[PDB]
Amino acid sequence: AMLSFEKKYRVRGGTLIGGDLFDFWVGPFYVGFFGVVGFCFTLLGVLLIVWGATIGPTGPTSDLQTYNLWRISIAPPDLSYGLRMAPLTEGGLWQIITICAAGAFISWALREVEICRKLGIGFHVPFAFSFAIGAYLVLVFVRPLLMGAWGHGFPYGILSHLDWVSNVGYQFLHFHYNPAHMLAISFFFTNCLALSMHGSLILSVTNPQKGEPVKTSEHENTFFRDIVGYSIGALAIHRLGLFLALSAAFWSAVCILISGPFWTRGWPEWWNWWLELPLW
Amino acid sequence: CEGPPPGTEQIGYRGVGMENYYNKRQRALSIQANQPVESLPAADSTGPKASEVYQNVQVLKDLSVGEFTRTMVAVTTWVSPKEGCNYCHVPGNWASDDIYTKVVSRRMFELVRAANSDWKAHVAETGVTCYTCHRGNPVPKYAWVTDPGPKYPSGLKPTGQNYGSKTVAYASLPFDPLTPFLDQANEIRITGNAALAGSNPASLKQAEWTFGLMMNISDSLGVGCTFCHNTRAFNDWTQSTPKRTTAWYAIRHVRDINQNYIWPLNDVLPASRKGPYGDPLRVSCMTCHQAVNKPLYGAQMAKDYPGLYKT
Amino acid sequence: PEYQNIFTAVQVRAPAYPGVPLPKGNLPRIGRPIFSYWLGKIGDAQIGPIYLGLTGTLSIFFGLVAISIIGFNMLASVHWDVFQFLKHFFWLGLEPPPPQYGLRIPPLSEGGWWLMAGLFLTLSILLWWVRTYKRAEALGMSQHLSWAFAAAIFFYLVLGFIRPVMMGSWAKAVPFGIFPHLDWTAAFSIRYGNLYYNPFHMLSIAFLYGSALLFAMHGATILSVSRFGGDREIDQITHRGTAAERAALFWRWTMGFNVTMESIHRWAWWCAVLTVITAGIGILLSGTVVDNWYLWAVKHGMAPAYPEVVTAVNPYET
Amino acid sequence: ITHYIDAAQITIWAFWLFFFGLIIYLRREDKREGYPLDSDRTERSGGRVKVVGFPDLPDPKTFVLPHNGGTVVAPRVEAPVAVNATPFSPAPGSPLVPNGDPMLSGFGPAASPDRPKHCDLTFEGLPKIVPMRVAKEFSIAEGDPDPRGMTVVGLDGEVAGTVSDVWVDRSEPQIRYLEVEVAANKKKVLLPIGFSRFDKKARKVKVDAIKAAHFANVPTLSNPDQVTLYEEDKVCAYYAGGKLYATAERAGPLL
Amino acid sequence: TMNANLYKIWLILDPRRVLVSIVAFQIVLGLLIHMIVLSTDLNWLDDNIPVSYQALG
Amino acid sequence: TMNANLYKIWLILDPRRVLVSIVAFQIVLGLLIHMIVLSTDLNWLDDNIPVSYQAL
Amino acid sequence: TMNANLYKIWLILDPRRVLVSIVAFQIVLGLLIHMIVLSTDLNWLDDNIPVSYQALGK
Amino acid sequence: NANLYKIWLILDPRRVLVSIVAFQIVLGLLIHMIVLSTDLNWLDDNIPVSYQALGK
Ligand code: BCL
Ligand code: BCL
Ligand SMILES: CC[C@H]1c2cc3[nH]c4c(c3C)C(=O)[C@H](C(=O)OC)c4c3nc(cc4[nH]c(cc(n2)[C@@H]1C)c(C(C)=O)c4C)[C@@H](C)[C@@H]3CCC(=O)OC/C=C(/C)CCC[C@H](C)CCC[C@H](C)CCCC(C)C
Ligand SMILES: CC[C@H]1c2cc3[nH]c4c(c3C)C(=O)[C@H](C(=O)OC)c4c3nc(cc4[nH]c(cc(n2)[C@@H]1C)c(C(C)=O)c4C)[C@@H](C)[C@@H]3CCC(=O)OC/C=C(\C)CCC[C@H](C)CCC[C@H](C)CCCC(C)C
Numbered sequence A: 001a002m003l004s005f006e007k008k009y010r011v012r013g014g015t016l017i018g019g020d021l022f023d024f025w026v027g028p029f030y031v032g033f034f035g036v037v038g039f040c041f042t043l044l045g046v047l048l049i050v051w052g053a054t055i056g057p058t059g060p061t062s063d064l065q066t067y068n069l070w071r072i073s074i075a076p077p078d079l080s081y082g083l084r085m086a087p088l089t090e091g092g093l094w095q096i097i098t099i100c101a102a103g104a105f106i107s108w109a110l111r112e113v114e115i116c117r118k119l120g121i122g123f124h125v126p127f128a129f130s131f132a133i134g135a136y137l138v139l140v141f142v143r144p145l146l147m148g149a150w151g152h153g154f155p156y157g158i159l160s161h162l163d164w165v166s167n168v169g170y171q172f173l174h175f176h177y178n179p180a181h182m183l184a185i186s187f188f189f190t191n192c193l194a195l196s197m198h199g200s201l202i203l204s205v206t207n208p209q210k211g212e213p214v215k216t217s218e219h220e221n222t223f224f225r226d227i228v229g230y231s232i233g234a235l236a237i238h239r240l241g242l243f244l245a246l247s248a249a250f251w252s253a254v255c256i257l258i259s260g261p262f263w264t265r266g267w268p269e270w271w272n273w274w275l276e277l278p279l280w
Numbered sequence B: 001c002e003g004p005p006p007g008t009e010q011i012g013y014r015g016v017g018m019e020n021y022y023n024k025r026q027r028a029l030s031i032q033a034n035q036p037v038e039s040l041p042a043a044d045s046t047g048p049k050a051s052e053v054y055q056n057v058q059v060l061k062d063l064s065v066g067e068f069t070r071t072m073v074a075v076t077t078w079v080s081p082k083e084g085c086n087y088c089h090v091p092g093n094w095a096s097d098d099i100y101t102k103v104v105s106r107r108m109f110e111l112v113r114a115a116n117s118d119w120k121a122h123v124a125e126t127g128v129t130c131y132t133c134h135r136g137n138p139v140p141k142y143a144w145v146t147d148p149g150p151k152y153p154s155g156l157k158p159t160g161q162n163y164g165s166k167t168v169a170y171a172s173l174p175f176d177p178l179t180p181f182l183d184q185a186n187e188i189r190i191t192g193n194a195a196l197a198g199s200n201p202a203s204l205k206q207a208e209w210t211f212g213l214m215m216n217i218s219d220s221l222g223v224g225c226t227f228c229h230n231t232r233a234f235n236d237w238t239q240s241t242p243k244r245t246t247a248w249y250a251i252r253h254v255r256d257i258n259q260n261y262i263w264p265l266n267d268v269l270p271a272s273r274k275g276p277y278g279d280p281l282r283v284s285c286m287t288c289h290q291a292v293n294k295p296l297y298g299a300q301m302a303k304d305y306p307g308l309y310k311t
Numbered sequence C: 001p002e003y004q005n006i007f008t009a010v011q012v013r014a015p016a017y018p019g020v021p022l023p024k025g026n027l028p029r030i031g032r033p034i035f036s037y038w039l040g041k042i043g044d045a046q047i048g049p050i051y052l053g054l055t056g057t058l059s060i061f062f063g064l065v066a067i068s069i070i071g072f073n074m075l076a077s078v079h080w081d082v083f084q085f086l087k088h089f090f091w092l093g094l095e096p097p098p099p100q101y102g103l104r105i106p107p108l109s110e111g112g113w114w115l116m117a118g119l120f121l122t123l124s125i126l127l128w129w130v131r132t133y134k135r136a137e138a139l140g141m142s143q144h145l146s147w148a149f150a151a152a153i154f155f156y157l158v159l160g161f162i163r164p165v166m167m168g169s170w171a172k173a174v175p176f177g178i179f180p181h182l183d184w185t186a187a188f189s190i191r192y193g194n195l196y197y198n199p200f201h202m203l204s205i206a207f208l209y210g211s212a213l214l215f216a217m218h219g220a221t222i223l224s225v226s227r228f229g230g231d232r233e234i235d236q237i238t239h240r241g242t243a244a245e246r247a248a249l250f251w252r253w254t255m256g257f258n259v260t261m262e263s264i265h266r267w268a269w270w271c272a273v274l275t276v277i278t279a280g281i282g283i284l285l286s287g288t289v290v291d292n293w294y295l296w297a298v299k300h301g302m303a304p305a306y307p308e309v310v311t312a313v314n315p316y317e318t
Numbered sequence D: 001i002t003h004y005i006d007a008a009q010i011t012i013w014a015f016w017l018f019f020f021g022l023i024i025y026l027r028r029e030d031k032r033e034g035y036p037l038d039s040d041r042t043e044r045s046g047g048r049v050k051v052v053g054f055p056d057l058p059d060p061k062t063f064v065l066p067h068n069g070g071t072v073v074a075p076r077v078e079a080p081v082a083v084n085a086t087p088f089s090p091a092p093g094s095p096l097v098p099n100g101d102p103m104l105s106g107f108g109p110a111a112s113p114d115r116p117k118h119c120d121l122t123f124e125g126l127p128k129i130v131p132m133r134v135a136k137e138f139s140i141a142e143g144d145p146d147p148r149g150m151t152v153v154g155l156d157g158e159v160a161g162t163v164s165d166v167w168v169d170r171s172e173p174q175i176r177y178l179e180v181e182v183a184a185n186k187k188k189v190l191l192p193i194g195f196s197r198f199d200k201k202a203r204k205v206k207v208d209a210i211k212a213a214h215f216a217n218v219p220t221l222s223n224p225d226q227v228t229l230y231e232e233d234k235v236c237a238y239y240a241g242g243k244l245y246a247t248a249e250r251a252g253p254l255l
Numbered sequence E: 001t002m003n004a005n006l007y008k009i010w011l012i013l014d015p016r017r018v019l020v021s022i023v024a025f026q027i028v029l030g031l032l033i034h035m036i037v038l039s040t041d042l043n044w045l046d047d048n049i050p051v052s053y054q055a056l057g
Numbered sequence F: 001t002m003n004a005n006l007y008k009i010w011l012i013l014d015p016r017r018v019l020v021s022i023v024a025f026q027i028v029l030g031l032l033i034h035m036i037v038l039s040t041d042l043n044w045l046d047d048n049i050p051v052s053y054q055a056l
Numbered sequence G: 001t002m003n004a005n006l007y008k009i010w011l012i013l014d015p016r017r018v019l020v021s022i023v024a025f026q027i028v029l030g031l032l033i034h035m036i037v038l039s040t041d042l043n044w045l046d047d048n049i050p051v052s053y054q055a056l057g058k
Numbered sequence H: 001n002a003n004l005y006k007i008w009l010i011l012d013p014r015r016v017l018v019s020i021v022a023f024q025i026v027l028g029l030l031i032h033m034i035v036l037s038t039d040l041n042w043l044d045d046n047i048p049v050s051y052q053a054l055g056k
């Protein structure tokens, strides 16, 4: 089925790879070459996750195997394997799922580019999705490579990856003092504030008080000038929201990338360059 | 800023994230800066005991005259090499105790013998010599006194925290955990043993004092928290490393050193050895470890000096 | 290549807009508006005017008192030395009262200033809430902003007031300071047995991540259709245009379903609001109901188990 | 006394009940445009089966327009509009191919709905988007070049015409369109700022969307001093068709 | 010494904003002084005068 | 030593903004000075003078 | 020895902005120097000179 | 140089003056701060005498 206004946009072409071969929809989904390619990566990765849950860390007969949703964990190899492929039951399964995940993500983004070409719209969304992919690849590719072992990746488990985050963080004693981490968090918080402000404002002028007509661009600008003496503007709030969300992802990737590869001591002690300036 | 790649070590199970990272070039230079002085040649272990040859030997009674001389040579290089034998001895009278350095040194011998014989749960067979702390200086470089912190006006009580302090590795956590925990014996545990509320009165500020002590410990050993903990459950011994057990005994060892060996010497120590509160320079993890997981990278010096053990 | 509509290349100017006229009872606005060229590169160049009645005047007075009490105490903690105040600024703080005072008003020299800053900041925020409410009322707009603001105020109140009162001690509230409030954040997780295992912490993270996901998606979606006037969301909502059609089809073809130009702002509203609702609930339950979140997760069967490769003898057992 | 049920567990379950209720609320709101779906199931059923999925559509809300502009309802019954294209294959899920010259087909990225034939208005009730000829209180911000008199080039660098005016938003001051006096036919056509790059030192506006000769067929304004919503969509959509249609290479694929 | 044309201040400063700012300033000042004095030896609520009511029970 | 045309400053500086700024600055300065004095040995509230009022 | 045409500085720099800036700068500097002096041995408030007024009551 | 005066045909005299004033005030603050952080400190050096000692 199609949205009642959709048929007049379902045009042939705009593919990057594949042309007419895969140029079709399946229900709502556009497929194309990267839909097929992404589907294979995705279905394989998910089924290898279920297979990893089925055999557990030490075989399906041990007390450690579990289908409990919180406890399932597929883990990377020991650091001793370095940049080599571990045996499937010793972290190699995690490594293959990682390659599947990256391919699924990147194929998803290129499918999005083909959709933009069909619709004649800007490429902001696949560009923005690339920042999330970049952060994932810093976590499983750039940072592990710089330290010399794929085993620095995080495990694929709903709660087990929180244990990874905790223990990597406290390797630096007090990870809160990571300067790129402070900046990234500031962007995450500011983004959430900005999103609630934006959502609120659009809903409050299109759903005004009873008896009122729909409000105007002049109301939107007046409302925040009245509260903070400034209005960024209806176009610019979307510029701002995109800037804050991408900055949050970017400084995230930076903050984990420097943790190990470019800094090994506690994070509070980094700030000693400031304390030690010959000014005070 | 540092450059990749770092040195790495896996501590816990794969994916749990218990890993250590270090700078390779700083490690190599630290190893050079933590060299142990080569042991003296073995001495003649025969003849009369020092207990029956000398006039006022109260601790090293059972050494032969040769081993006793060798011990005196060794402590001179370890403690007062620039000054020599008479840093601890009245000129022309070796038996005299009329110099404060000799009285202090006598108790220092008992400290080391107690550590090497009675505290192996901490120092194992590696043990300690005078060198471990003094490093060739009469005053150990990494002794400590109670820290008063920055000045406040008279109408505002100091908080003991919120200040950039090397002692807690530049966090704004309570910056003197040494006095309450490595001298006095305040409770370090705050984590509950039951899921539900009802039986744990420990406080968030106690958590911060404990966190401050743990920053100091980590910095003193040059390690991260996962050297001893799985940080998903800091309290859970079953998920901790064997280094945590060792560290537990080391805290009690340090308390014993400060309470029973350093503090009772306060009256004979000069005013130059005391902090603004009148307390003597004394011992923390840093004093021996000096930012290394084992003092001197674990060099076994004490085993070659029989006088550094009890009986 | 194409124009990405990130920066305005050519700004235009018009006489400053004084704002939509307000009903009788509102005070006249104040300030002579100015224009910033550099703000005009990314957004609106006009700064001002501003509204300021009794609610906001009282809010700002309470808030400046609170802020000045904090800064004063920071400077006093380095003995008035302005150079050391700049050196240690991120470390300095205004500290909650000692535990011995419980919830009683503590002495000026040891916690009274914290209690006054918390009181006056709280009144300042509550009055700011009334301000956001009144400013929507005077324009004839609905109260979506004040409802979301109330959800954030709920979380703030739980952190510094509700939980400390429930737990019987101002010493359990949050210090005013940069690095000190980060110490407090980490110490709270330590004290309560690892906040990762608090299920409302997990939800708050899902919604904080989701807020950045959704603003990246929506921000980028709207700029990609700004070539069709899609940033003018009021008239795209009343009079669906090819901006709104292409936006919805981009997402339907990508992930199988889509929303509307109006209803994406409802998804965004709830995602952001649920971030602080779940955050308040999570802290509200810590110490009062659950003393150790990890053991609560063990009890309910959630905590992963690992092969034992390190373990330690308990010297309290030995 | 010990119990498995505890207040944290109670509260998290209460949250799930609320959250799933919220999702169903939101999915209903999501269906106020575009539903019921155009399917081949409704065709063969003679219209008997309306495809709406789950949850079902909400009851209509009303938008009351200012200045006595009327009432908009959502959801609403919208009339089918013929598609100027033929399916590339008869199989379901296949794309369609525009009839005639693609630029002019009103199909694909050239497509757009028929918005209302009246102008967006300022709060005071004047036409919102107007040329600087009409809104004489507007000026170019000092520091920025005046686009008037710049030469407009198409995707292949050929001269399409000159900028004859600038169309501004009177509600929120900004350029929304450039007015281009087209060399080929001397008509004045709108050019959205969204499709315009400034080459400031050369005083050139570059338009990647279409060729210079394509400017001859940019849709025209009924009234030279204002623009209706309807005309805004027809203008912007015509440029966007060029993104896919203006050259052969733009069809893809790369490989 | 006051001034006979002091009344002309209301030709200079807006009477409504002056009134609003005085009300606001005095509310904050009143709350601030009570809290400052309650944080000192002068506290009249926790002074056990005339008696301690927590000791009666 | 003063100047005879000093009144002309009000041809230069707006009387309204000057008056407002003066009273805002003086009120803040007075808050600040009382805070400084209260934080020192000169504190007159917690000095137990003429007596301490906190009974046991 | 300053120049005779130095008054022409008020043809270049705005007398209003200059007067406001000097006033603002001088106030901040005054606050800063008092604080710097109070942070040192020169402190005249907590020096208990002439007497300690807290000692009277404690 | 004889033609150095032409620099005022290139650089706005007003902005150069303001920038010179702003930079010199900041530099002056910076250098006093730096010098006070060291052994040369003349305020906290108990010279000619310690006034806190006087009060004891
Ligand atoms: C003791 C533990 C430490 C700590 C240890 C660390 C460590 C270690 C890390 C962080 C990272 C982060 N921390 Mg921290 N951190 C702590 C406390 C905090 C606090 C707080 C309130 O105290 C906050 C706000 C933060 C905030 C942050 C963010 C800046 C960052 C996580 C966002 C991110 O990476 O986005 C980027 C987003 C992604 C990587 C997601 C990628 C998504 C991909 C592309 C798509 C997936 C699709 C999916 C499979 C689809 C499924 C389909 C459905 C099934 C249908 N931390 C403490 C003090 N922190 C992390 C980071 O920066 O990572 C880069 C990180 O590694
Ligand atoms: C031991 C250290 C000394 C001390 C050494 C000095 C020295 C030295 C000086 C001051 C100066 C000042 N000191 Mg002090 N000062 C001490 C303790 C105090 C205490 C206190 C609570 O203890 C207070 C509140 C003051 C307050 C003051 C201000 C009155 C004055 C700076 C005003 C300014 O910056 O104008 C900036 C504003 C402008 C430039 C705008 C134009 C000025 C307007 C038109 C006039 C405003 C009123 C004027 C300053 C009145 C001054 C009268 C008396 C001389 C005080 N001092 C002690 C006892 N103090 C300075 C001063 O006297 O300046 C004359 C100064 O040189
Ligand atoms: C959906 C959850 C998120 C959220 C929502 C939210 N926050 C909100 C709102 C909403 C919906 C508001 O409506 C409200 C707001 O007004 O935002 C624009 C607010 C707000 N969120 C704020 C901050 C904030 N929100 C945060 C978080 C969040 N807000 C979430 C992540 C954070 C974090 C992450 O820590 C902070 C730091 C403020 C910007 C604003 C509330 C402002 C307020 O209460 O002000 C009164 C308090 C004062 C201290 C007033 C002080 C006055 C100033 C110092 C100005 C001084 C003026 C003076 C006259 C100057 C004179 C000097 C002369 C020399 C000229
Ligand atoms: C950069 C700013 C933020 C951002 C933006 C962003 N994300 C995006 C987009 C954009 C602009 C999309 O267009 C795209 C999308 O289509 O959204 C609807 C996407 C998306 N962001 C998503 C998720 C998401 N984004 C997140 C974050 C962020 N995305 C940022 C903070 C996170 C966090 C923070 O954790 C997650 C969970 C998806 C909804 C969607 C991408 C969907 C996709 O790629 O589908 C293909 C893949 C599958 C269907 C599943 C693949 C399965 C794998 C093959 C196996 C699983 C391996 C995995 C590594 C295991 C992980 C296990 C544990 C960690 C639990």
Ligand SMILES: CC(C)=CCC/C(C)=C\CC/C(C)=C\CC/C(C)=C\CC/C(C)=C/CC/C(C)=C/CC/C(C)=C/CC/C(C)=C/CC1=C(C)C(=O)c2ccccc2C1=O
Pocket: A039, A042, A043, A046, A047, C213, C217, C218, C219, C221, C222, C244, C247, C248, C251, C252, C255, C256, C257, C258, C259, C260, C261, C264, C267
């Ligand atoms: C049940 C089942 C099949 C089990 C079998 C499992 C096995 C073995 C295999 C299945 C796995 C395989 C092979 C494929 C599954 C993948 C498929 C086909 C679909 C899943 C797609 C997918 C990633 C869905 C995730 C959707 C989620 C949760 C997104 C999070 C972001 C989010 C909350 C979006 C909701 C709001 C939306 C829709 C925003 C988009 C949106 C935005 C942002 C606007 O700005 C805008 C402006 C104007 C108009 C409309 C819009 C608009 O729609």
Ligand SMILES: CCCCCCCCCCCCCCCC(=O)OC[C@H](COP(=O)(O)OCCN)OC(=O)CCCCCCCCCCCCCCC
Pocket: A203, A207, A208, C142, C147, C151, C273, C277, C281, D011, D012, D014, D015, D017, D018, D019, D020, D021, D022, D025
């Ligand atoms: C732990 C326990 C759970 C915690 C959850 C806490 C949730 C509340 C905290 C957040 C407060 C929000 C305040 C604003 C609300 C608001 O604004 O709603 C009003 C607006 C509508 O306004 P409008 O724009 O249409 O017009 C404005 C003109 N007046 O939006 C909504 O109708 C959203 C719809 C409400 C959500 C429905 C949820 C139903 C759950 C049913 C569960 C059934 C299970 C049964 C099991 C037996």
Ligand SMILES: COC(C)(C)C/C=C/C(C)=C/C=C/C(C)=C/C=C/C(C)=C/C=C\C=C(C)\C=C\C=C(C)\C=C\C=C(C)\C=C\CC(C)(C)OC
Pocket: C067, C068, C070, C071, C072, C075, C105, C115, C117, C118, C119, C122, C156, C157, C159, C160, C161, C173, C174, C175, C176, C177, C178, C181
């Ligand atoms: C010298 O400084 C001057 C004067 C120049 C001005 C400078 C000021 C500066 C530099 C200030 C800097 C401030 C900073 C850096 C602040 C950082 C603050 C942070 C990070 C705060 C974070 C969290 C704090 C929280 C959440 C606190 C909450 C406290 C609450 C909610 C308390 C409420 C208390 C109440 C309602 C009390 C009621 C009193 C009752 C009624 C109980 O009395 C009996």
Ligand code: HEC
Pocket: B053, B054, B055, B056, B057, B058, B059, B060, B061, B072, B073, B075, B076, B079, B080, B084, B085, B086, B087, B088, B089, B094, B095, B096, B101, B102, B103, B105, B106
């Ligand atoms: C301080 C660190 C010392 C230095 C340096 C040297 N000696 Fe020592 N000596 C020291 C102590 C604490 C003691 C008493 C030991 C005990 O068991 O009670 C001594 C004792 C001697 C003696 C015995 C004197 C006697 O009682 O008859 C002798 C002969 C002696 N020391 C010699 C000696 C020499 C030759 C040294 C330099 C190489 C020397 N000592 C250094 C502490 C310290």
Ligand SMILES: CCCCCCCCCCCC[N+](C)(C)[O-]
Pocket: B196, C289, D005, D006, D007, D008, D010, D011, D014
């Ligand atoms: C929606 C919130 C419902 C909360 C119900 C809990 C009421 C009593 C809570 C006190 C602690 C209860 N319990 C079982 C954990 O001890």
Ligand SMILES: [Ca+2]
Pocket: E044, E045, E046, E047, E048, E049, E050
């Ligand atoms: Ca009383």
Ligand SMILES: [Ca+2]
Pocket: F044, F045, F046, F047, F048, F049, F050
């Ligand atoms: Ca008194």
Ligand SMILES: [Fe+3]
Pocket: A198, A202, A238, C218, C222, C233, C265
């Ligand atoms: Fe929007």
Ligand SMILES: [Mg+2]
Pocket: B161, B162, B172, B173, B174, B208, C175, C180, C183, C184
């Ligand atoms: Mg603290």
